[PDB]
């Protein structure tokens, strides 16, 4: 009873991920930095379908056009000799220090002109390394105090920058969606845009709303306490789920990016269940760290753990879902009846009808049990192979 | 040096606010119920100048037609007599059993439809008695457990329901816009549209969106962790501020409701900066309960002190932005370049300029220092009368 | 593969558990008021080991001393009917009025002294129907305000009332002991000895400190994001875990009381393992609620979930420990090497023992990784059952 | 009207504090290094009384004895030339990749050997320059996960190395005692001793507990969502307050070391109050981080910050205290009734005395109202200046 995962799994991992050197708020690097092309074998070899990157983890900062084009050979031989793709990639506008106010919402109008050049530049290498998706994270967009940032301003600021995306994409033609990723706080006090529903609604009011979706990140969105799998479900019903990142958080504190089924295991469950079931097609990212109290070893078996967890997880709400005990569980509880429309006789047909009101018998109605409890053991039981 | 309200303030109070009896999960009622007409006159001589109400909390659930007339009869002499208004009604969706899976979405079909009959009779009321926002603050929406809601089903019949009360308003001509109430959890485990970004996400599905906005509350989005005044101003930008609750929180915790002003003091000042700045100009409403401890003076101490934080902030926040030591400041820290359009000159003249890139000077950018703190102390001295 | 709770398993309920009527701060009871006989011959067929009791739970408020001899009479005939016995009692100090300020450390005198005397009343009950520990939740000692109370002279007052009923228990020849029980909030603002660590220290400060202990519940020390089994740790490392409550929680939020291995499920597991390992011999206390959405059954479905998930993690906790690769890889992570003295040869020696400093060679110390990856993913294997 | 520190006030800071370079787990520092020796010139300046420091913020890691002495030397040139003390010193068990799984708690035998050699040379120091208290904050004590560290094994650890430290002091006569600091999280998953309860509690059980106290910080209690005046209120009982760490947090998110009076303003209010209230003596030292956002300027203005809002909110306190109109609100709350004893009759008088049980009139006691929203409301209009 083993589970290995196979390209085909499509499981993704940016370079910064198994790259990362440990160095956090309060410590040194623990870990020698990987040369990408070594990254992508090793990968490669565990069975990852691809990795992503941000401009600055493949040409480090300031490289000469010289520099740039032998990275990018190095890493193109690398991609050809695994048979690894590249579905996303990313701007880093959040490192160096000119970006300490942000990107797209600096305060400095020479800084906001800066990084969308730099984001113009690594949108034709993304598409010249085949990515269909260009994902967004304004880290540095947000505030430690409330005079600093007048909001509206910032999003009218935010609002431009991706609009001057929309039509660069399209005036070269390129078949690239942008993906926006939602963080609540870390770096800044406040980041704009903190969570999945503000990013949905600010894609509204762009003038292309069709190239834009949402990257949701497990861990941000349990920064704020929130449900992740009920976060998703919203982004699927909007159309928006463009790419996930996925990973493990142990609720509202500092961003862990734990390995994926590390953190909230329940919640890890739900979202496989979710994925699986709407039939998402996009990759299965992982945007995270192994513990700086890790070696090499150590970093390759918590990649590893990654998709392992994913794989099981898979296999268990799909028994849950096939079980034909579930299945009668699932209609006790009505979720039949949710599925149904509540008036599609229409609005004239509702106020006529007495069944709705005058003689609803609302006692009746009340008595009836939910008999949710039973169908959450059924799904505990089915988790933990008790089932 | 005293801060009066006066009906031209337009502060407003819901009966269910001052008329708690204090009744908690763990606890008895306290104080006897208090008649909406002694409310009314009471919330009057204090300088209030209006109520809202749930239909439940001005006619008994159950009561006759006859007693319905009556009930309303009553409450509308005691408006005569006081000059007070009623700008909002909403619905009790949640107190009755019945309503344990929820209103709007609950499993059973036949509930949903009964929700919809008795969310109907109370907009006719409502219509009749002058308010022109209905609120909706589905409270029983959501779970407590994975499978007992499909949420993709679930805002279906969230979406069928607004769009069938958009379909009546229009029907019957009437002059009434809805505000939809979020909140993330309490009294279910996680509720649906959690936070103002979820429900102004939603509202973009509905067939008719002009009809419909939010009616934040403070202590809601900080269940969350969240920035209240970025939230708003988030609304704001998107035209959808058609209410507001004030009152305080201490954080992620239970849903407090403690007197405004209360809580969070510094958020309250920088809301208040921003309702008064972005001119507001709807109800400010106080949705709060006088904790449990006190008894009927207690309560109207607690009212009234709701009003009397509203006018101090107000006043310092007005000093602040009038204070020429703090216009230098905005300017330091370049709050003026952030209201100019990054590239008005348009994405060809935005790729040809070589000052956005190729000759950005990258290190003197960053050097620059924003001057926050020097700004965020000058905004502390003023809400301490310390200037 | 079944999992069947037998008396032996001491697993232990509150009346209050399985009899709660489902009132919450936003809506009416959906269940009537059970029998407490009831309650315990229902207990019994599902092989639960015991029950546990407020003063109120038992006999009605206010009930005369005819009455109370005959709601005790009832109560045990049917411990004797079934075999049931009653480990542990506490007090209600906070649902009548009067406490709405605290029962102990209420600012009102009169209140105080009323407190202990309701409260030495049931440890004679308690004695009688043999039970070995008294539990002492002060859920309305603290306070929404700063003014409201000096916490100083709180403690003094909370010592004093402990140390009375030491003086009484001791002066009776009682063999009963205290276990106080710590939660941060609700329904108070904050609440005194909010955490584990709290209680621990106070106790300290007791005049006979060997009366008291700590009863920790899951989703209190949950309730301000601190890890359950570290908390555990730190009461055993004490001596001082006299009773425990289980439950589940979602996190920062409002107190769920769901059923054992809901909310936080790897905690759950990491609980039972230091529980068994370090040979507790307590009841294993549930202290939760069915959801309202239940009917009866629905109850009975909750309360059997609660034992069979202590049940499966007992096995895999087990199967873990057991397992021959995990005790190689716990040696692999020097967990043997923690459980060895730092300096056994003393200060002297210590300081002498230029291995220690002057030759330590940190680079080669810092490079060695801790394997603690590969060891979760074997705990992670072992609790789905993926092993 | 204004508020000018003196070295009277005893106001102290860390090198680390304005000598932080703004390097965060996304980014880059923005400040070049401060000397040593600049720091204390500009904080005599600003009129503080003196600096604290970690080994290694001194001494450069590695350092041989030859540049160890000179850096001392110029650092106490400067302390001569400046009037500055040193009231506290602590060690960096934290950045050196060796410390990675802990310093005392480390799984390695070896390093925590090193930990505590590298301890007992910086207390050495620190009675040379003249400290008083020296703080331990085990940052790296904790784990991510699980199996990873056996917490009673880690206690023993932690024990063993804090009573060695106990026998070196006395060995050598020193005046010195040790505070420890709690952080519940950050950089670890999970960090032991998490709050002041759990240091106190931990403290108790040390071979000579006179020697050791509390070190609490505003934001690591807050990180917890935890009072951090009731904290420090019990903190005082215990007769343990030996030092404190001032700054401000907004809530449980990541530790942001704001300039102390941001973040909760109200509780720095409340905070102030009791200081100045129970006579505490110790010095008043800031432990904060200026915003990466800001250039030397900007460090300067958030240091001076600091000082005038302690300043401010003890003027406010003061003038809270004295005014005889919340004397009597004091009175009226009963906060004269929590300072006398509940029984001071004794048990036996007290299980005699009807009027405490059998004549008590629980009605009339409990419809006696608190009082505490109008004592709320003064003390607004004093921390605000509208009174
Ligand atoms: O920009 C980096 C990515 O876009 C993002 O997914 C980070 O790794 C933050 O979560
Ligand atoms: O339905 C009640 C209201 O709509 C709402 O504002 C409540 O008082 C919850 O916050
Ligand atoms: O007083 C009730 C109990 O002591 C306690 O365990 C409650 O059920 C709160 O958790
Ligand atoms: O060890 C550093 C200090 O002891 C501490 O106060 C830190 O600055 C963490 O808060
Ligand atoms: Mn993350
Ligand atoms: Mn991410
Ligand atoms: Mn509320
Ligand atoms: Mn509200
Ligand atoms: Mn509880
Ligand atoms: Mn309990
Ligand atoms: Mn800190
Ligand atoms: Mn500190």
Chains 1, 2, 3, 4 share one sequence.
């Not at 401009?55 to 990018?72: N, Q």
């Not at 845009?193 to 509204?204: D, R, W």
Request: proline share 5%; glycine share 10%.
């Amino acid at each position: 009873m083993n589970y290995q995962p196979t390209p085909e799994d499509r499981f993704t991992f940016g370079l910064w991920t198994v790259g990362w050197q440990g160095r956090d708020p309060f410590g040194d690097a623990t870990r020698r930095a990987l040369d990408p092309v070594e990254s992508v074998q090793r990968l490669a070899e565990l069975g990852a379908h691809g990795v992503t990157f941000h401009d600055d983890d493949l040409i480090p900062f300031g490289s000469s056009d010289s520099e740039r084009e032998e990275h990018v050979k190095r890493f193109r031989q690398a991609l050809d000799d695994t048979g690894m793709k590249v579905p996303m990639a990313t701007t880093n506008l959040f490192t160096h220090p000119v970006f300490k106010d942000g990107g797209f919402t600096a305060n400095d109008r020479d800084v906001r002109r800066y990084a969308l050049r730099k984001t113009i530049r690594n949108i034709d290498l993304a598409v010249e390394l085949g990515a269909e998706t260009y994902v967004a994270w304004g880290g540095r967009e947000g505030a430690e105090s409330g005079g600093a940032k007048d909001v509206r301003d910032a999003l009218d600021r935010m609002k431009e920058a991706f609009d001057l995306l929309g039509e660069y994409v399209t005036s070269q033609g390129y078949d690239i969606r942008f993906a926006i990723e939602p963080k609540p706080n870390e770096p800044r006090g406040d980041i704009l845009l903190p969570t999945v529903g503000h990013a949905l609604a600010f894609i509204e009011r762009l003038e292309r709303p069709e190239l834009y979706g949402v990257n949701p990140e497990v861990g941000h969105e349990q920064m704020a306490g929130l449900n992740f799998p009920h976060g998703i479900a919203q982004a699927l019903w909007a159309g928006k789920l463009f790419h996930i990142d996925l990973n493990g958080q142990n609720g509202i504190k500092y961003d862990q990016d734990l390995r994926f089924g590390a953190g909230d295991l329940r919640a890890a469950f739900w979202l496989v269940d979710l994925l699986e079931s709407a039939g998402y097609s996009g990759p299965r990212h992982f945007d995270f760290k192994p513990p700086r109290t890790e070696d090499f070893d150590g970093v390759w078996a918590s990649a590893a753990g990654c998709m392992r967890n994913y794989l099981i997880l898979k296999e268990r709400a799909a028994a849950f879902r096939a079980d034909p005990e579930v299945q009668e569980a699932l209609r006790a509880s009505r979720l039949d009846e949710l599925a149904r429309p509540t008036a599609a006789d229409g609005l004239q047909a509702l106020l006529d009808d007495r069944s709705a009101f005058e003689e609803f018998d609302v006692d009746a109605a009340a008595a009836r049990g939910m008999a949710f409890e039973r169908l959450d053991q059924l799904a505990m039981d089915h988790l933990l192979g008790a089932r």
